[PDB]
Motif scaffolding. Sequence first.
Motif, mmCIF file in Angstrom:
data_model
loop_
_atom_site.group_PDB
_atom_site.id
_atom_site.type_symbol
_atom_site.label_atom_id
_atom_site.label_comp_id
_atom_site.label_asym_id
_atom_site.label_seq_id
_atom_site.Cartn_x
_atom_site.Cartn_y
_atom_site.Cartn_z
ATOM 1 N N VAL A 1 0.784 -1.228 0.000
ATOM 2 C CA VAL A 1 0.000 0.000 0.000
ATOM 3 C C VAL A 1 0.819 1.284 0.000
ATOM 4 O O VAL A 1 0.357 2.308 -0.501
ATOM 5 C CB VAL A 1 -0.968 0.041 1.203
ATOM 6 N N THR A 2 2.029 1.252 0.557
ATOM 7 C CA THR A 2 2.827 2.470 0.563
ATOM 8 C C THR A 2 4.344 2.314 0.654
ATOM 9 O O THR A 2 4.897 2.115 1.733
ATOM 10 C CB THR A 2 2.369 3.413 1.691
ATOM 11 N N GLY A 3 5.003 2.412 -0.499
ATOM 12 C CA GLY A 3 6.455 2.336 -0.563
ATOM 13 C C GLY A 3 7.173 1.037 -0.245
ATOM 14 O O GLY A 3 7.857 0.480 -1.104
ATOM 15 N N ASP A 4 7.038 0.569 0.991
ATOM 16 C CA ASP A 4 7.691 -0.660 1.446
ATOM 17 C C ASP A 4 7.887 -1.727 0.366
ATOM 18 O O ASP A 4 6.947 -2.093 -0.346
ATOM 19 C CB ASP A 4 6.899 -1.258 2.610
ATOM 20 N N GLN A 5 9.120 -2.219 0.256
ATOM 21 C CA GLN A 5 9.460 -3.258 -0.712
ATOM 22 C C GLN A 5 9.190 -4.598 -0.037
ATOM 23 O O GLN A 5 9.917 -5.002 0.871
ATOM 24 C CB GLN A 5 10.938 -3.160 -1.095
ATOM 25 N N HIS B 1 -4.755 2.615 6.315
ATOM 26 C CA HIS B 1 -3.307 2.650 6.180
ATOM 27 C C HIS B 1 -2.736 4.021 6.530
ATOM 28 O O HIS B 1 -1.583 4.325 6.201
ATOM 29 C CB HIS B 1 -2.904 2.268 4.752
ATOM 30 N N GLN B 2 -3.523 4.848 7.208
ATOM 31 C CA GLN B 2 -3.027 6.175 7.546
ATOM 32 C C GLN B 2 -1.891 6.072 8.560
ATOM 33 O O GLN B 2 -1.786 5.092 9.304
ATOM 34 C CB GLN B 2 -4.160 7.084 8.057
ATOM 35 N N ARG B 3 -1.027 7.078 8.564
ATOM 36 C CA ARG B 3 0.113 7.094 9.467
ATOM 37 C C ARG B 3 -0.152 7.986 10.667
ATOM 38 O O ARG B 3 -1.092 8.782 10.673
ATOM 39 C CB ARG B 3 1.355 7.588 8.720
#
Lengths: 329, 329, 329, 329
Positions: A59-63, A305-307
């Motif tokens: 969902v966000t960046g993480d590989q 998935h908010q931070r």
Amino acid sequence: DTNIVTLTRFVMEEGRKARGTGEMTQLLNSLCTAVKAISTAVRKAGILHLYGIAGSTNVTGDQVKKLDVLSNDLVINVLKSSFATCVLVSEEDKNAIIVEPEKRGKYVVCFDPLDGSSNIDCLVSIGTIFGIYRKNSTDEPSEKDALQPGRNLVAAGYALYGSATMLVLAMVNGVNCFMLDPAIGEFILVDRDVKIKKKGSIYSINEGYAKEFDPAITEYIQRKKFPPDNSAPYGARYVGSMVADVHRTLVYGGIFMYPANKKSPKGKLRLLYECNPMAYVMEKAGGLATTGKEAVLDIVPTDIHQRAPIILGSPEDVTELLEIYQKHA
Amino acid sequence: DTNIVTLTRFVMEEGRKARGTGEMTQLLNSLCTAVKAISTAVRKAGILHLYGIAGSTNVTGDQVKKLDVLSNDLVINVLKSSFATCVLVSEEDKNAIIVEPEKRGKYVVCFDPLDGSSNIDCLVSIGTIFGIYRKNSTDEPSEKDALQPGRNLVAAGYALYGSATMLVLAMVNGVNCFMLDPAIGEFILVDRDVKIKKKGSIYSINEGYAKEFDPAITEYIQRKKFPPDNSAPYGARYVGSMVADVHRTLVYGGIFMYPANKKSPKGKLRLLYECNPMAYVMEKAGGLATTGKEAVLDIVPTDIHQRAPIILGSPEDVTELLEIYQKHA
Amino acid sequence: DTNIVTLTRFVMEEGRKARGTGEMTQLLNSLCTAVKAISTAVRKAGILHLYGIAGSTNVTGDQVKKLDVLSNDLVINVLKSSFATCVLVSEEDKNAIIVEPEKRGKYVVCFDPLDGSSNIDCLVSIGTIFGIYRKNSTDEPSEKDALQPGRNLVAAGYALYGSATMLVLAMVNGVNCFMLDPAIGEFILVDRDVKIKKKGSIYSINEGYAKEFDPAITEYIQRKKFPPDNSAPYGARYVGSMVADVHRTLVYGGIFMYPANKKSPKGKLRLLYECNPMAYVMEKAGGLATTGKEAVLDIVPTDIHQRAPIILGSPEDVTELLEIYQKHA
Amino acid sequence: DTNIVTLTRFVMEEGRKARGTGEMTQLLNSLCTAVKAISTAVRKAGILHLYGIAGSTNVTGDQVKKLDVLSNDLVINVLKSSFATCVLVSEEDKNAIIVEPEKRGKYVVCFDPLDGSSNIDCLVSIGTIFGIYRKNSTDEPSEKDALQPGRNLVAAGYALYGSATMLVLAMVNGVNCFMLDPAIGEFILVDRDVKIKKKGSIYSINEGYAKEFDPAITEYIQRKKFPPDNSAPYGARYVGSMVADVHRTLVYGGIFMYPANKKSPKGKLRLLYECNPMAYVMEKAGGLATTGKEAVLDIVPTDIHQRAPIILGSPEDVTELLEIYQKHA
Ligand SMILES: O=P(O)(O)OC[C@H]1O[C@](O)(CO)[C@@H](O)[C@@H]1O
Ligand SMILES: O=P(O)(O)OC[C@H]1O[C@](O)(CO)[C@@H](O)[C@@H]1O
Ligand SMILES: O=P(O)(O)OC[C@H]1O[C@](O)(CO)[C@@H](O)[C@@H]1O
Ligand SMILES: O=P(O)(O)OC[C@H]1O[C@](O)(CO)[C@@H](O)[C@@H]1O
Ligand SMILES: [Mg+2]
Ligand SMILES: [Mg+2]
Ligand SMILES: [Mg+2]
Ligand SMILES: [Mg+2]
Ligand SMILES: [Mg+2]
Ligand SMILES: [Mg+2]
Ligand SMILES: [Mg+2]
Ligand SMILES: [Mg+2]
Ligand SMILES: [Mg+2]
Ligand SMILES: [Mg+2]
Ligand SMILES: [Mg+2]
Ligand SMILES: [Mg+2]
């Protein structure tokens, strides 16, 4: 040694007080099975060739790593077969997973199947984080069921795959630690009603972000290094895995920080399956968890998935940082 | 999967080149048995009630933990029964241990039975460190046999009890990593001829000592946080266990530092069983290890428990710090 | 519990008496690794889908099982990498295996990688049997090197995968039992200088062959059931796995029999890797092993897969049967 | 391999059909924990010094072994903490154990904590046997609650500690085998809806009792050795542990016998915790279980420790023996 106080007995003998359907025990039982499987693979990941990437971006960046996928699959499957869940939220899944009618239960589970992605290949401690909610609606289960403030948690914790595998569980009345005995495959109670020290002597943050830190964080760190009252400076620790640093904060006291910065208004860590579970554990242990302006558990999410920025640990340490923020406000 | 490349086969098939008495293989074999026993107890320390102190202070300050004693006993015993050692040096023992004539071998072994004392109770990665020398004298074995510069090492490494248990072994021609398979109890080769990156992007040090750091260390850290060329700042990592931080440096690259300070002219880490073994591993992997003024492996010890500042990791990172020291000299 | 008396230490501290090249220790060390791997797979064979056939018939009739192949591969490989063997004889291999010059040692090893084929699928005890000879020739290694009488054995034993995994080892001066500790993966001494009772009270044979038994065996069994002196009849036991029945005979005493019959002049069990190793163990324990007419260990083989009748166990029991044969001769 | 079909999931997903209180799952879950603990100790009994006697004689003759006590304690404790039992019957306990009001459930459990006492020290397969009844009374729980005919069983089975540890479970609709995976500590389904062959080719009995056998048993054995129709004689097998011999009968077919004799009118095996559970498993698998005159499951007990002759296995084999008894009646 013929009277094993397992996590299952503990919980079962716990929910006894408020005699329920018993599906919380089914849920935790299922989760324990997934955590044992993950622990077994992790302790021999290299031999199993489980290091490396899987070829995808969540969902966000993480590989995405191979262990991300394996652990995610294990958790999803055991939770579904538990007949105790209806909505599942995973760091690895773009949208919430709605459990088929046949296996639906009343709980909503948010989890990070494997936390500490950057520390996998260097064999540093990693873990699994989870937060459990009670579905508070009559409508068909949906993603909205996971958009509840952390204060509505009925259970939360994490599995730490460190020098030993530990399952830390927090519920309404407290926090307890259960260690996995590899020989018999059971999580055994080793720490009861855990409480965090009022003030510690360790601060944990990635100082590599000094250039982006706000004035408050900057002042606090400087104060930890140069105490105005000639007291001993705090020691620094930053493992790099939230589960490892938070667990140390819990048992040793002190503070853990992943604040917002000039490039990340809401920090990095995810509210649903990282910040809330740890904030919940921290508070049931007598600690605090803040964004620097508001309690983490009081934030009402709008994105699964908010931070959220997070500062947690010993009350006196967190409060000291809060006063700095208030001062700079 | 019926052709297991164990550490024993590897070494045996290694020393084959320079056909020796084969006692190095006996020594490493014995050590592997001790490391497996330590690993088993560590993965279930809480259940075994192995956390806590033993009620004693070693050669210098350190408050002896239960695992210190257990691991120390296991190592001493397996090394003696190996018929490959004559002089043993342990962090836990005030004086060198001379092996009885009947079980004497030609090697001298310096070791830290359990490194990362402060991280035991919080379940953070810990380990075992060892350095092996060849007795270069005709006289009766004595403590003097252990007072050799690290450059005379014939083998060195460490056992890391992290997410998985890994035995990292360095010898004259290189570094290899062997992972312990808990199921069959064998260390299996998983990384061959390991080499460290020329330059990394992680710096590791306890910044809680900022007030005591010398101008050089201070300047270097500031540079890592605020790169003069607008490059991305380095990330910070500090697990707190030398074995864990050094292993990450090895596989990810970067720099690890435990420099001398205004209160500790020679740093904290011990030269014989902490600094030299890691310096040796680092150099065989293409890295560097300095005190900030001289190569760690070139120091000629006068005390088996003497301390030494240590800066190690990627050559370009270590060299950058060296230039700063030279600049301030 | 920090002074583990492993099989390796025992043997190493054994061969010390007659200081050798130490390759016997290398050989046993290698074998132990194979036995641990087999034990691990066996304890979870069904989960690994290792039950069933492999689709082949060995040197004589036997329908090859999946575990036959797996165990055979493991043993061949560890023995070769041991640098201690030159000729290998396996129940699963039609011809002797000559070790490549580079990895040659002075020992010849005959083994049954997995004994008790018929009991695999019903989860009954199974095992591994081995006999070790010293190459007594100058010529290039060949099959002839394995055609030596059992009396020339320098070491023999078996690994029993029963309620616990045990490695029973016999050498010139005696028999010792080492139990595998699954937790640390080490065979630990649990029974020293084992000796069999002079007379037991258990007889073990497949009475389903009553129609084919010779008059002597028939008379003996009848005597065990109807004692002429009103003594208590012997109890009957027949697990079906030679390794299991022989081990029980060793520790409980009594007799084990797989005699020749009207359809099998030389019985069923194989001389090289089944009969000789057990006969050797039995004699070093103070027992006897006969075909009914001659000592098993004195037979000079002409075929690496030849069969031999075998009667072994407590001296007084075996002698009683011998007198019957002599009587009927 | 991320969808583990454990015994718990199976049962839970089983009792789903007839949605109950779910305490049967709690009961089996608890029992599984005890069986894993017993299995772990058994696989390393010698190292733990668990062989030998405890210095006591149970309800009838049997010399109590150390493992008898350990396993008995483990089972009693897990069953009580399960909140699913009210009356417990154990081979090791003179009288029935009434569960305290606080932890009472609706089930009655009869069990042999450790079966195969005579085979413990020789490392032969041993096990645990259990039979579960539903309390069919309103009165306070008492020993009478365990005096029900085997036909009233709602669940029964055994844990076999053989080459692998297997938990065989039979319920109203069938028999399933679950193998314990030592690595993760979970019993995994490996055999579904097991059915025994209609006719086998193995007979299992202690022929050491030939002198005491009744004419029927004598004739049957003679027929197995000398088939009147020139068919191949049956093979003989007798491990000595009821759990091992019965399991082989189940998966291979054939017959198992421990009949009454001239000195034992009611045989040796105990009806409540040995004969009934095995008879139940046998019948749910399509087999038969008789005393030679009446079905084992139809006997109404008057003593929780009463004995019963038992003949079980393939229907055609058991029926053949029944015809002989009827013939001699
Ligand atoms: O490298 P950084 O920015 O310090 O991030 C580390 C943090 O990120 C996480 O790996 C989450 O992705 C946490 O476990 C850890 O606390
Ligand atoms: O708490 P400090 O001063 O950073 O010390 C940590 C260092 O000390 C050690 O624990 C040795 O005592 C090392 O393993 C570690 O690198
Ligand atoms: O079924 P039978 O003829 O009694 O053979 C059993 C014997 O055969 C073996 O399985 C060898 O093939 C032995 O382990 C065992 O003693
Ligand atoms: O030695 P015997 O009389 O054949 O008894 C063996 C039987 O006794 C038991 O050990 C029960 O005590 C069973 O497990 C086994 O079937
Ligand atoms: Mg991630
Ligand atoms: Mg995470
Ligand atoms: Mg994650
Ligand atoms: Mg110390
Ligand atoms: Mg140290
Ligand atoms: Mg130490
Ligand atoms: Mg065969
Ligand atoms: Mg065989
Ligand atoms: Mg075989
Ligand atoms: Mg008994
Ligand atoms: Mg029994
Ligand atoms: Mg019993």
